[PDB]
Design a protein around this motif. Structure first.
Motif, mmCIF file in Angstrom:
data_model
loop_
_atom_site.group_PDB
_atom_site.id
_atom_site.type_symbol
_atom_site.label_atom_id
_atom_site.label_comp_id
_atom_site.label_asym_id
_atom_site.label_seq_id
_atom_site.Cartn_x
_atom_site.Cartn_y
_atom_site.Cartn_z
ATOM 1 N N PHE A 63 0.704 -1.214 0.000
ATOM 2 C CA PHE A 63 0.000 0.000 0.000
ATOM 3 C C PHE A 63 0.715 1.232 0.000
ATOM 4 C CE2 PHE A 63 -3.975 -2.298 0.384
ATOM 5 C CZ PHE A 63 -3.481 -3.314 0.522
ATOM 6 N N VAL A 64 -0.030 2.390 -0.153
ATOM 7 C CA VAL A 64 0.658 3.674 -0.101
ATOM 8 C C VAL A 64 -0.072 4.478 0.756
ATOM 9 C CG1 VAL A 64 1.891 4.139 -2.272
ATOM 10 C CG2 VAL A 64 -0.522 3.961 -2.083
ATOM 11 N N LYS A 65 0.592 5.144 1.743
ATOM 12 C CA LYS A 65 -0.206 5.820 2.715
ATOM 13 C C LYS A 65 -0.240 7.302 2.324
ATOM 14 C CE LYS A 65 0.575 5.806 6.896
ATOM 15 N NZ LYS A 65 -1.010 5.539 7.026
ATOM 16 N N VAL A 66 -1.250 8.048 2.606
ATOM 17 C CA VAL A 66 -1.285 9.327 1.890
ATOM 18 C C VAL A 66 -2.530 10.104 2.637
ATOM 19 C CG1 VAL A 66 -0.723 8.446 -0.642
ATOM 20 C CG2 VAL A 66 -2.983 8.450 -0.008
ATOM 21 N N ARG A 67 -2.721 11.418 2.307
ATOM 22 C CA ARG A 67 -3.712 12.031 3.073
ATOM 23 C C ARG A 67 -4.953 12.367 2.324
ATOM 24 N NH1 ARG A 67 0.195 15.456 2.995
ATOM 25 N NH2 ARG A 67 -1.165 17.314 3.069
ATOM 26 N N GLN A 68 -6.080 11.963 2.808
ATOM 27 C CA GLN A 68 -7.504 12.215 2.462
ATOM 28 C C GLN A 68 -8.144 13.426 2.954
ATOM 29 O OE1 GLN A 68 -10.305 8.753 3.009
ATOM 30 N NE2 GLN A 68 -11.960 10.260 2.837
ATOM 31 N N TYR A 69 -8.525 14.303 2.056
ATOM 32 C CA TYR A 69 -9.141 15.439 2.495
ATOM 33 C C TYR A 69 -10.430 15.364 1.869
ATOM 34 C CZ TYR A 69 -4.489 17.576 3.327
ATOM 35 O OH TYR A 69 -3.450 18.077 3.715
ATOM 36 N N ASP A 70 -11.461 16.239 1.917
ATOM 37 C CA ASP A 70 -12.921 15.948 1.793
ATOM 38 C C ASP A 70 -13.485 17.262 1.445
ATOM 39 O OD1 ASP A 70 -13.570 13.091 2.254
ATOM 40 O OD2 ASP A 70 -13.269 13.068 4.365
ATOM 41 N N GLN A 71 -14.412 17.186 0.635
ATOM 42 C CA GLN A 71 -15.008 18.399 0.255
ATOM 43 C C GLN A 71 -14.039 19.485 -0.129
ATOM 44 O OE1 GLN A 71 -17.493 16.777 3.628
ATOM 45 N NE2 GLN A 71 -18.149 18.834 3.234
ATOM 46 N N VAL A 72 -13.081 19.239 -0.984
ATOM 47 C CA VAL A 72 -12.311 20.226 -1.504
ATOM 48 C C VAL A 72 -12.727 20.963 -2.855
ATOM 49 C CG1 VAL A 72 -9.597 20.734 -2.141
ATOM 50 C CG2 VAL A 72 -10.347 18.645 -0.522
ATOM 51 N N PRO A 73 -12.528 22.206 -2.883
ATOM 52 C CA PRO A 73 -12.565 23.064 -4.000
ATOM 53 C C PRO A 73 -11.525 22.849 -5.013
ATOM 54 C CG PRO A 73 -12.671 24.437 -1.806
ATOM 55 C CD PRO A 73 -12.627 22.943 -1.626
ATOM 56 N N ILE A 74 -11.832 22.302 -6.182
ATOM 57 C CA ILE A 74 -10.864 22.277 -7.188
ATOM 58 C C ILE A 74 -11.744 22.787 -8.382
ATOM 59 C CG2 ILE A 74 -10.879 19.616 -6.269
ATOM 60 C CD1 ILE A 74 -12.077 20.066 -9.285
ATOM 61 N N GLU A 75 -11.170 23.006 -9.526
ATOM 62 C CA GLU A 75 -11.823 23.410 -10.655
ATOM 63 C C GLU A 75 -11.117 22.648 -11.732
ATOM 64 O OE1 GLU A 75 -11.824 27.662 -10.870
ATOM 65 O OE2 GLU A 75 -10.895 27.575 -13.015
ATOM 66 N N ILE A 76 -11.856 22.142 -12.666
ATOM 67 C CA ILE A 76 -11.392 21.234 -13.811
ATOM 68 C C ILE A 76 -11.976 21.893 -15.105
ATOM 69 C CG2 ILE A 76 -11.288 19.047 -15.136
ATOM 70 C CD1 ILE A 76 -11.237 18.270 -12.263
ATOM 71 N N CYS A 77 -11.189 22.191 -16.074
ATOM 72 C CA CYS A 77 -11.523 22.794 -17.297
ATOM 73 C C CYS A 77 -12.609 23.627 -17.078
ATOM 74 C CB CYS A 77 -11.858 21.820 -18.414
ATOM 75 S SG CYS A 77 -10.268 21.019 -18.916
ATOM 76 N N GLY A 78 -12.641 24.313 -15.893
ATOM 77 C CA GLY A 78 -13.560 25.541 -15.699
ATOM 78 C C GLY A 78 -14.846 25.320 -15.040
ATOM 79 N N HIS A 79 -15.099 24.051 -14.794
ATOM 80 C CA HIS A 79 -16.080 23.493 -13.922
ATOM 81 C C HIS A 79 -15.454 23.430 -12.537
ATOM 82 C CE1 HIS A 79 -18.188 21.163 -17.329
ATOM 83 N NE2 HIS A 79 -17.721 22.298 -17.760
ATOM 84 N N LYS A 80 -16.147 24.212 -11.786
ATOM 85 C CA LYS A 80 -15.897 24.280 -10.326
ATOM 86 C C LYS A 80 -16.715 23.309 -9.505
ATOM 87 C CE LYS A 80 -16.379 28.892 -9.475
ATOM 88 N NZ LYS A 80 -15.196 28.290 -8.918
ATOM 89 N N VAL A 81 -16.046 22.591 -8.683
ATOM 90 C CA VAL A 81 -16.771 21.494 -8.000
ATOM 91 C C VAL A 81 -16.195 21.035 -6.648
ATOM 92 C CG1 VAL A 81 -15.461 19.424 -8.782
ATOM 93 C CG2 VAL A 81 -18.690 19.596 -8.329
ATOM 94 N N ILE A 82 -16.811 20.019 -6.038
ATOM 95 C CA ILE A 82 -16.527 19.717 -4.593
ATOM 96 C C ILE A 82 -16.388 18.192 -4.585
ATOM 97 C CG2 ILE A 82 -17.375 19.800 -2.257
ATOM 98 C CD1 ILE A 82 -18.478 22.277 -2.588
ATOM 99 N N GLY A 83 -15.142 17.769 -4.165
ATOM 100 C CA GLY A 83 -14.948 16.355 -3.736
ATOM 101 C C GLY A 83 -13.590 16.028 -3.100
ATOM 102 N N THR A 84 -13.588 15.064 -2.151
ATOM 103 C CA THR A 84 -12.451 14.258 -1.629
ATOM 104 C C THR A 84 -11.347 14.195 -2.546
ATOM 105 O OG1 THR A 84 -14.304 12.890 -0.585
ATOM 106 C CG2 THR A 84 -12.093 12.164 -0.402
ATOM 107 N N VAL A 85 -10.133 14.525 -2.058
ATOM 108 C CA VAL A 85 -9.092 14.377 -2.902
ATOM 109 C C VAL A 85 -7.975 13.854 -2.099
ATOM 110 C CG1 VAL A 85 -7.212 15.765 -4.138
ATOM 111 C CG2 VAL A 85 -9.641 16.506 -4.114
ATOM 112 N N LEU A 86 -7.050 13.016 -2.625
ATOM 113 C CA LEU A 86 -5.909 12.394 -1.819
ATOM 114 C C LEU A 86 -4.636 12.939 -2.242
ATOM 115 C CD1 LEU A 86 -6.679 8.822 -2.364
ATOM 116 C CD2 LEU A 86 -8.083 10.255 -1.016
ATOM 117 N N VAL A 87 -3.809 13.252 -1.215
ATOM 118 C CA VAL A 87 -2.547 13.983 -1.396
ATOM 119 C C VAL A 87 -1.525 13.209 -0.754
ATOM 120 C CG1 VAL A 87 -1.131 15.807 -0.824
ATOM 121 C CG2 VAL A 87 -3.362 16.400 -1.179
ATOM 122 N N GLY A 88 -0.412 12.979 -1.485
ATOM 123 C CA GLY A 88 0.878 12.242 -1.256
ATOM 124 C C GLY A 88 1.493 11.697 -2.682
#
Ligand SMILES: Cc1cccc(C)c1OCC(=O)N[C@@H](Cc1ccccc1)[C@@H](O)C[C@H](Cc1ccccc1)NC(=O)[C@H](C(C)C)N1CCCNC1=O
Lengths: 99, 99
Positions: B53-78
């Protein structure tokens, strides 16, 4: 056939005469199918390489159907955690990404 | 915006008021990003399908924007040789596969 991704996009391809499960991986660029035997000639090809390349067989111009989508394309053969359609076959069945 | 796949689907996102490029991956259940501080709490999470496995950090309800669509979801960082946009967010923005 339009396909939300709330579920993993596994589809049934017909290939080799036989039918099998596969995953439409836009993240995968080549197409690997679990071990299968296909006729005639092929040439070795490495893929992966995060920690080694797995070596697999390369077959070119192979008849496959995906969703009544009869297509014909390069199709690697040998060890795979699971069947994977990649971008190589998708372009020839005409899949896009749409939002 | 319809993205044929002769190519790797690499789109720019804007997470973190920063700008990153990231790959559109229907092959991926989640969205993993190459370390990038974010505020908020986190849970540890494991990923990676083999030799650990790979251990890494889960965050939730994050603001990101993708090709200009702004949206909300969990994202994992590491640790990932690459940004990856997997289904979680593709549903969020309402991307599909077509053919
Ligand atoms: C052969 C095979 C059979 C069945 C199932 C699987 C998962 C199999 O393939 C292993 C593989 O890496 N598959 C990928 C696609 C694949 C299979 C065969 C040919 C080409 C690609 C993708 O799905 C998962 C895999 C996991 C990963 C590996 C290394 C570091 C971090 C993540 N992700 C990646 O490789 C992606 C790449 C391809 C842009 N990746 C690399 C950098 C950081 N992030 C990231 O997301």
């Amino acid at each position: 056939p339009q396909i939300t991704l709330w579920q993993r996009p596994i589809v049934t391809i017909k290939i080799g005469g036989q039918l099998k499960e596969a995953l439409l991986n836009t993240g995968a660029d080549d197409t690997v199918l679990e071990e299968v035997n296909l006729p005639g000639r092929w040439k070795p090809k490495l893929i992966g390489g995060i920690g080694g390349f797995v070596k697999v067989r390369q077959y070119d111009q192979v008849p496959i159907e995906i969703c009544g989508h009869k297509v014909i394309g390069t199709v690697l053969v040998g060890p795979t955690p699971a069947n994977v359609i990649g971008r190589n076959l998708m372009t020839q069945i005409g899949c896009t990404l749409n939002f």
